Design a protein around this nucleic acid. Structure first.
Ligand SMILES: NC(=O)CC[C@H](N)C(=O)O
Ligand SMILES: [Mg+2]
Ligand SMILES: [Mn+2]
Ligand SMILES: [Mn+2]
Ligand SMILES: [Mn+2]
Ligand code: NA
Ligand code: NA
Ligand code: NA
Ligand code: NA
Ligand code: NA
Ligand code: NA
Ligand code: NA
Length: 93
RNA sequence: CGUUGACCCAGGAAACUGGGCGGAAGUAAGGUCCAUUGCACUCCGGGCCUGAAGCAACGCG
């Protein structure tokens, strides 16, 4: 059950795990700033959190258009799988 | 690690206190093998190899 309730934050997974934290954080900001003001991008390479990212948008509408537009797009040879986050991010909340 | 400073944040009328901020550390980060498709925000799976830096300057390790 993919989280479909619109939220300020999008959840991305199926990310290439071999990409370095900094390069990844930078590429996602590149890919997503078109859609609106990004407040932050949260990336971790721990066991639980690798292959995933959260990008936080100032406007929900930015999150939606970003989610809708980049869905499934090949990124480092892997299709991005995007949902909304299940719960608000901290700066948003 | 010391001294004398810079700048940011919290508090304070102020003096200043606490942190950001130094030998930090075999840490952060990185390469590879294995494992993992995972909703988090207080870092952080395992093996092998490698491996930094406070913001400035001097001094000392
Ligand atoms: N990391 C350190 O302690 C640096 C000390 C050195 N003497 C310097 O001024 O840079
Ligand atoms: Mg194999
Ligand atoms: Mn004050
Ligand atoms: Mn020592
Ligand atoms: Mn120095
Ligand atoms: Na203050
Ligand atoms: Na007072
Ligand atoms: Na300090
Ligand atoms: Na590493
Ligand atoms: Na690594
Ligand atoms: Na929290
Ligand atoms: Na490892």
């Amino acid at each position: 059950v993919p989280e479909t309730r619109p939220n300020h934050t999008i959840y991305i997974n199926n990310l290439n795990e071999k990409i370095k934290k900094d390069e990844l954080k930078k590429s996602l900001h590149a890919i997503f700033s078109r859609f609106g003001q990004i407040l932050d991008i949260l990336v971790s390479r721990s066991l639980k959190m690798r292959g995933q990212a959260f990008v936080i948008f100032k406007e929900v509408s930015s999150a939606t258009n970003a989610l809708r537009s980049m869905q499934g797009f090949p990124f480092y040879d892997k299709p991005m799988r995007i949902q909304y986050a299940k719960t608000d991010s901290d700066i948003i909340a």
